[PDB]
Amino acid sequence: GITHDKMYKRSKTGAVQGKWHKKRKYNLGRQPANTKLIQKISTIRCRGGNIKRRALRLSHGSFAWGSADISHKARILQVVYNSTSNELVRTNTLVKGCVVQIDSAPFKSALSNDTLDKEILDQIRGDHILARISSRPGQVGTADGYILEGPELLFYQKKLAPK
Amino acid sequence: SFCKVNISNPVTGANKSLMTIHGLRMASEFDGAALFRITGGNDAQGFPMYQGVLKSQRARLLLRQGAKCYLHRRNGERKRKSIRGCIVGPDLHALSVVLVDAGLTDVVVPKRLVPKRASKIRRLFGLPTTKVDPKDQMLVCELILKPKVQRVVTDEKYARKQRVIAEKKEIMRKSLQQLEEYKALLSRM
Amino acid sequence: ARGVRKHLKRLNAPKHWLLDKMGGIWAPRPTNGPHGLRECIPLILILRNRLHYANTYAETSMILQDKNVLIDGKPRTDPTFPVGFMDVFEIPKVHKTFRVLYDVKGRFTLVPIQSNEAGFKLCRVQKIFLGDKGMPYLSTHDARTIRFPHPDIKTNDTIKINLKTGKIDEWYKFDIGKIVMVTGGRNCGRIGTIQAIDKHMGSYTMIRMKDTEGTEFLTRLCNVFVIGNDSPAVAIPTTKGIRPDIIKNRELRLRSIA
RNA sequence: GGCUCAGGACAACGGUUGCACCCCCCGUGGCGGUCGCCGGACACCGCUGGCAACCCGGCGCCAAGACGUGCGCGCAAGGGCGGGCCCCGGGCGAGCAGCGUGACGCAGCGACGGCCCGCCCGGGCUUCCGGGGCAUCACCCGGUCGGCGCGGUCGCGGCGCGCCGAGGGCCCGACGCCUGGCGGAGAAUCAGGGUUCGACUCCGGAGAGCGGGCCUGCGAGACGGCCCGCACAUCCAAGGACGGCAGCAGGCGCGGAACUUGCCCAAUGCGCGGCGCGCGGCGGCGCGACGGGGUGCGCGCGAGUCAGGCGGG
Ligand SMILES: [K+]
Ligand SMILES: [K+]
Ligand SMILES: [K+]
Ligand SMILES: [K+]
Ligand SMILES: [K+]
Ligand SMILES: [K+]
Ligand SMILES: [K+]
Ligand SMILES: [K+]
Ligand SMILES: [K+]
Ligand SMILES: [K+]
Ligand SMILES: [K+]
Ligand SMILES: [K+]
Ligand SMILES: [K+]
Ligand SMILES: [K+]
Ligand SMILES: [K+]
Ligand SMILES: [K+]
Ligand SMILES: [K+]
Ligand SMILES: [K+]
Ligand SMILES: [K+]
Ligand SMILES: [K+]
Ligand SMILES: [K+]
Ligand SMILES: [K+]
Ligand SMILES: [K+]
Ligand SMILES: [K+]
Ligand SMILES: [K+]
Ligand SMILES: [K+]
Ligand SMILES: [K+]
Ligand SMILES: [K+]
Ligand SMILES: [K+]
Ligand SMILES: [K+]
Ligand SMILES: [K+]
Ligand SMILES: [K+]
Ligand SMILES: [K+]
Ligand SMILES: [K+]
Ligand SMILES: [K+]
Ligand SMILES: [K+]
Ligand SMILES: [K+]
Ligand SMILES: [K+]
Ligand SMILES: [K+]
Ligand SMILES: [K+]
Ligand SMILES: [K+]
Ligand SMILES: [K+]
Ligand SMILES: [K+]
Ligand SMILES: [K+]
Ligand SMILES: [K+]
Ligand SMILES: [K+]
Ligand SMILES: [K+]
Ligand SMILES: [K+]
Ligand SMILES: [K+]
Ligand SMILES: [K+]
Ligand SMILES: [K+]
Ligand SMILES: [K+]
Ligand SMILES: [K+]
Ligand SMILES: [K+]
Ligand SMILES: [K+]
Ligand SMILES: [Mg+2]
Ligand SMILES: [Mg+2]
Ligand SMILES: [Mg+2]
Ligand SMILES: [Mg+2]
Ligand SMILES: [Mg+2]
Ligand SMILES: [Mg+2]
């Protein structure tokens, strides 16, 4: 099947290398989850047992605002940025590290307590917050994360600018 | 041969032979016109009809352990077979049939054996399973290997269970004691 | 292979098992459990090949079936059971209680003991770690484990165990000046005193001992079991861990026939 | 466990490291807290069948140390915060492992109590040094050399994919071609230094006619397991089914060149449990080769024959 054995690669001088066995089972690869946004979680049986959870069609996640230390659950609304390609953005495909808009309703009671990050408060006054996925959807069947702040927030807002 | 027709009233109990059903598919109700329901059959060469193939001929398919037509030899063996048949068309030498909505029905074939479960026997002769006397060592069976009923609770079984149950509390008693022991060690250290 | 190994050729058997190159193509392969595969000698090779209690496998088996063999105060029924260093060997029908020690050529000897002696077991503290919910454990050279261990007990020391209740009563500290016996190497079976513990970043630490007649030797720290504190806590064979040299041995081999 | 050496020359293999990048049955020692005795149904078997033989159909009465559900004192995976802003005990050489606290989730173990954890043997990959001939093979490579990001994996890694850069190897012999190439432990020869061979006893690797794919399981890319293509053969009422001796004996062919179509599991070991085992053993063929003793001595023997022990399943 799919394999990640190195024997099919060349050496560090460019020479074709020979073939001295047939494919081993312990070097198998599988196809990837390609987790669509918006509820299935398949089970995969790995080497020696070891249930692996493999997601398709996630809708919600647990999101943490760290500097204020408030966590709520929320509905992922849209994937907006991704460092690899525009294709995974255009398809709303949930992979680790992508940046999404989450529902604002859960975090609207934090709109009371002042002396907080106004760049988070004015965005809560709207109807979404910007966050990053921290989990691996295709390995553990879950998409949780944290809300952006710091230089990183400004970096992604400028990437999202109306250019 | 024309068409052996295994007939079987599933009530009286009877497996009889016999010699507007063309096109019929499994689970269809023909009306004893010139020979009711089809639950099986076997075209020539023996090849059995299979459910869902929606055809009137043959189709090799890959069968997994647990399907019809397949006596496997190891756990996980698969094999390809010619499960053929028809929608009860022409090339059907032999067939299976069942009488519904009843020379005709007059015979009975008794329940060859008897139940053997503690609950079973009681629900059968209208008896509960919640009052402390589940012994029920009456032996009728019409004296006819085949008794020794199951799941019948006793004193021995009861006590043994209690033993394990209690033990699964003493474990924690001494464990949570040792917790305090080690806490005190540290605290005096 | 495609899985674990079950068989064991006679030539591939450990050299110190003292098997003979004829008399078969196969050897008994030890079973997993309280000791390893290299630093052990099976129960069958002790009974059938040493003491002649059985002249064959087919009647060593039944001795182990009617449960005639107490190891560490508990019976055993597996011919391939790995008995090792410091294990207690008592058969009651012939009134014999032993402990396993090493001779001065790296082989397993059974020392006689007394009923006041078979009440404890010496184990080497292999490591200290944390399990469920944050609890400490000590795991040893006989694959015993002890939870909530007294903090003074640290890695590489020695503990004294009761065979029945399974709990620690005494411990001995691996420091400079402790009576200790080796378990591997080419000084296996020799006894001396810890008088150097030289440490090296990243790599093994080396240990230098001397017998009670001046002869000195070296080994890794993995091979220095502690037996007492300037006096052994268990018994040791009348050679006491002093090795002769080849010419002294040759004259003794001359004497035994003379 | 047995067989063989076809493929493969910075492989494999040999010594020497590491996993703070991993996986593991049995066995040993621990540990065990989890937000009133249930349900129907399967095989063997009864009654009726199809088929040339291969192999199966329909109906029915019956159990669990089989499933399914589950009675229970909250804790499986993963995720956010909780470190020091010259530099340097739970455990280390090394900020590693635990725990606490905010969110998710409801997994596993419970109808004869086991999820889980150390050790063990085994595996995977991994650092360094060694690791065939040809120059009438002088330049070679382009996922090739590095970077970022995700994915997949038991896991690290151009292993895969996107984007960025232009690297990487070489007369200390790269790259390419050839081999009637398995590597080592070893063997033949013989003052010393050396030459040549490594089929086969142990260890390691690789295969089961040749490409491939996979299911079941802790563990296999298994062929005395399955599925397809190719090359070959087999029975058949002509519709169909079916094979893999580089396992042991034996046959054909090839070649200068190599034995019985035996008996036994009694030992040795392994499996399960008193048996099974073409492992392994015991006889047969056997001037390949090794070791010992005769064909006389001056008058007693061995070579054969017939009996009894001993030994031997
Ligand atoms: K593969
Ligand atoms: K293979
Ligand atoms: K494999
Ligand atoms: K199978
Ligand atoms: K092999
Ligand atoms: K394996
Ligand atoms: K295995
Ligand atoms: K051998
Ligand atoms: K041997
Ligand atoms: K064994
Ligand atoms: K036997
Ligand atoms: K052969
Ligand atoms: K070869
Ligand atoms: K060849
Ligand atoms: K295994
Ligand atoms: K086994
Ligand atoms: K390596
Ligand atoms: K290397
Ligand atoms: K290497
Ligand atoms: K090298
Ligand atoms: K050359
Ligand atoms: K590319
Ligand atoms: K990469
Ligand atoms: K690429
Ligand atoms: K490139
Ligand atoms: K060259
Ligand atoms: K060859
Ligand atoms: K020379
Ligand atoms: K020489
Ligand atoms: K020489
Ligand atoms: K010469
Ligand atoms: K010479
Ligand atoms: K040979
Ligand atoms: K071989
Ligand atoms: K070999
Ligand atoms: K071998
Ligand atoms: K081998
Ligand atoms: K091997
Ligand atoms: K081999
Ligand atoms: K192989
Ligand atoms: K091959
Ligand atoms: K083949
Ligand atoms: K092949
Ligand atoms: K193949
Ligand atoms: K494959
Ligand atoms: K294959
Ligand atoms: K061959
Ligand atoms: K051959
Ligand atoms: K034979
Ligand atoms: K010939
Ligand atoms: K000839
Ligand atoms: K035997
Ligand atoms: K044989
Ligand atoms: K004579
Ligand atoms: K004679
Ligand atoms: Mg051998
Ligand atoms: Mg070789
Ligand atoms: Mg299977
Ligand atoms: Mg096989
Ligand atoms: Mg044959
Ligand atoms: Mg010839």
Side-chain angles (χ1 to χ4, degrees), chain A, chain B residues 1 3-6 8-14 16-30 32-57 59-90 92-130 132-141 145-189, chain C residues 1-229 231-258:
Chain A
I2 297 169
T3 199
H4 57 263
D5 209 291
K6 66 181 181 180
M7 183 179 72
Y8 293 163
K9 298 298 293 295
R10 291 161 181 241
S11 66
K12 65 182 180 180
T13 64
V16 165
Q17 306 174 309
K19 291 177 70 68
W20 52 282
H21 65 59
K22 293 181 181 179
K23 281 191 190 133
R24 297 288 92 101
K25 188 269 183 182
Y26 62 85
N27 299 328
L28 71 86
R30 291 177 191 101
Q31 312 177 267
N34 282 111
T35 306
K36 300 290 94 175
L37 163 69
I38 60 182
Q39 174 54 282
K40 291 178 70 68
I41 302 299
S42 75
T43 285
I44 307 300
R45 187 269 187 189
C46 313
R47 179 153 181 101
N50 317 302
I51 301 299
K52 211 182 271 183
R53 306 297 290 161
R54 179 145 289 161
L56 295 91
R57 298 137 37 190
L58 309 189
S59 296
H60 303 73
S62 296
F63 289 61
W65 180 4
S67 89
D69 168 7
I70 297 158
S71 296
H72 288 78
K73 162 150 163 213
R75 184 176 177 87
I76 303 287
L77 298 174
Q78 201 66 348
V79 192
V80 301
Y81 196 84
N82 204 275
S83 296
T84 69
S85 176
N86 196 237
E87 175 188 283
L88 296 182
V89 166
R90 207 161 65 190
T91 317
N92 277 321
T93 300
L94 272 51
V95 298
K96 184 177 180 180
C98 56
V99 170
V100 298
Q101 306 171 327
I102 62 170
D103 199 323
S104 78
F107 293 99
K108 292 177 71 68
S109 80
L111 188 153
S112 164
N113 176 339
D114 291 331
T115 53
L116 271 68
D117 189 358
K118 148 182 82 183
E119 310 161 356
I120 302 299
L121 281 184
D122 279 311
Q123 184 177 182
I124 297 170
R125 292 180 179 91
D127 50 332
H128 65 279
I129 298 89
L130 271 168
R132 200 145 164 261
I133 301 299
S134 47
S135 296
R136 284 177 101 210
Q139 309 276 303
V140 305
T142 284
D144 303 354
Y146 70 108
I147 297 89
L148 297 154
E149 46 179 20
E152 184 178 2
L153 182 62
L154 188 153
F155 172 95
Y156 293 101
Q157 306 186 348
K158 288 294 271 203
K159 298 293 183 182
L160 287 186
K163 181 266 290 181
Chain B
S1 76
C3 253
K4 272 48 187 183
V5 177
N6 290 318
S8 47
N9 293 265
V11 176
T12 47
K16 180 67 174 66
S17 296
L18 183 62
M19 283 73 74
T20 61
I21 62 170
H22 293 331
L24 273 188
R25 65 183 180 179
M26 299 163 83
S28 296
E29 294 293 328
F30 64 95
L35 61 83
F36 263 101
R37 186 209 281 101
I38 298 89
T39 61
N42 293 92
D43 85 328
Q45 303 105 27
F47 282 136
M49 303 192 314
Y50 198 86
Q51 184 67 41
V53 170
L54 308 164
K55 298 183 69 173
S56 82
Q57 55 173 187
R60 298 169 65 61
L61 276 168
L62 188 50
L63 278 296
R64 292 180 179 91
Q65 65 182 357
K68 280 73 176 175
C69 296
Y70 190 43
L71 294 174
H72 59 291
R73 319 185 65 211
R74 293 181 182 178
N75 189 359
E77 183 178 1
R78 293 179 292 173
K79 164 184 182 59
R80 209 172 303 271
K81 299 193 65 61
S82 294
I83 51 171
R84 177 176 183 104
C86 212
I87 31 64
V88 190
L92 191 31
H93 288 224
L95 183 67
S96 296
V97 176
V98 176
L99 181 61
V100 66
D101 58 57
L104 61 83
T105 187
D106 54 53
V107 297
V108 176
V109 64
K111 292 182 183 292
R112 186 274 304 278
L113 282 184
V114 298
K116 183 174 73 175
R117 183 177 292 171
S119 178
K120 182 64 70 177
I121 62 170
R122 292 189 296 272
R123 29 177 281 191
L124 182 63
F125 293 170
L127 210 51
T129 61
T130 314
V132 167
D133 185 74
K135 288 326 172 303
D136 191 277
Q137 327 285 357
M138 54 207 297
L139 282 72
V140 180
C141 183
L145 277 296
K146 182 69 175 177
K148 184 178 184 292
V149 176
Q150 295 298 290
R151 292 180 181 177
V152 64
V153 176
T154 62
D155 265 337
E156 190 276 331
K157 184 177 184 293
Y158 190 87
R160 187 269 186 189
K161 185 176 180 180
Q162 296 294 321
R163 182 179 62 83
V164 176
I165 297 170
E167 181 64 26
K168 298 293 183 182
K169 280 73 176 175
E170 183 66 26
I171 296 169
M172 283 315 258
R173 183 181 64 82
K174 182 174 72 68
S175 178
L176 294 174
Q177 183 62 255
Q178 300 162 210
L179 276 296
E180 294 293 328
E181 293 180 353
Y182 196 75
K183 295 286 217 223
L185 275 296
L186 188 153
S187 179
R188 312 177 263 191
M189 293 177 70
Chain C
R2 270 169 290 141
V4 290
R5 291 161 155 80
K6 296 182 181 43
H7 291 82
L8 191 67
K9 292 289 184 184
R10 175 73 74 97
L11 295 184
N12 215 21
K15 182 67 181 294
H16 58 64
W17 290 5
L18 264 185
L19 277 296
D20 72 90
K21 66 182 290 294
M22 308 315 258
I25 289 295
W26 284 117
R29 200 209 164 71
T31 180
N32 286 0
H35 284 141
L37 188 153
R38 185 180 67 189
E39 68 275 16
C40 84
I41 192 66
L43 183 63
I44 179 173
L45 291 167
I46 296 169
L47 282 71
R48 165 185 74 171
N49 271 113
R50 208 81 47 191
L51 283 72
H52 295 89
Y53 278 130
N55 297 115
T56 187
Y57 193 118
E59 68 172 352
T60 285
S61 282
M62 294 182 286
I63 300 299
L64 280 83
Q65 317 191 339
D66 50 48
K67 292 181 181 180
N68 290 318
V69 188
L70 275 151
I71 309 310
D72 291 357
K74 184 178 184 293
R76 295 291 185 269
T77 50
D78 214 25
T80 77
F81 186 89
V83 64
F85 197 77
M86 304 297 110
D87 285 11
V88 183
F89 204 89
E90 190 277 332
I91 297 169
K93 292 177 71 68
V94 176
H95 294 37
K96 295 302 181 33
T97 187
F98 308 158
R99 183 178 295 112
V100 176
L101 281 85
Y102 274 123
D103 63 358
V104 286
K105 295 127 172 163
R107 305 193 289 230
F108 276 120
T109 77
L110 297 145
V111 65
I113 62 170
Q114 276 69 225
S115 296
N116 57 42
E117 182 65 26
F120 58 109
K121 169 158 280 273
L122 282 187
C123 276
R124 186 161 173 281
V125 176
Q126 291 315 114
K127 66 183 291 294
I128 293 320
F129 67 93
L130 311 163
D132 273 337
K133 181 67 174 66
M135 281 153 180
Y137 279 97
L138 62 84
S139 163
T140 182
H141 96 283
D142 272 13
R144 283 85 169 94
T145 187
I146 301 299
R147 185 179 67 189
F148 312 134
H150 206 296
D152 297 345
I153 297 169
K154 309 191 64 173
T155 303
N156 299 291
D157 283 17
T158 298
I159 62 170
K160 183 178 183 292
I161 294 316
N162 183 243
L163 295 174
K164 296 174 181 303
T165 51
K167 309 214 208 193
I168 297 169
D169 65 357
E170 301 286 65
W171 58 75
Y172 324 125
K173 295 180 177 67
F174 176 109
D175 289 308
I176 61 170
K178 310 278 316 183
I179 192 66
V180 298
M181 164 183 201
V182 181
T183 61
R186 64 177 281 221
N187 315 297
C188 167
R190 305 193 316 141
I191 296 89
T193 299
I194 300 298
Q195 65 183 358
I197 58 176
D198 288 326
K199 303 198 163 183
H200 283 304
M201 272 153 165
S203 66
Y204 308 69
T205 183
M206 285 285 311
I207 308 294
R208 182 179 63 83
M209 284 74 74
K210 69 182 307 193
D211 70 317
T212 187
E213 294 294 328
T215 300
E216 296 200 347
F217 53 71
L218 282 72
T219 178
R220 305 193 173 161
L221 174 83
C222 64
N223 284 336
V224 176
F225 182 76
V226 176
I227 296 146
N229 56 329
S231 177
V234 286
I236 61 170
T238 61
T239 315
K240 274 190 307 293
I242 190 167
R243 221 177 271 161
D245 66 305
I246 54 157
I247 62 170
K248 180 68 173 66
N249 174 310
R250 200 209 172 221
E251 89 179 2
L252 302 160
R253 178 70 274 172
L254 279 191
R255 193 185 136 171
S256 66
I257 62 170

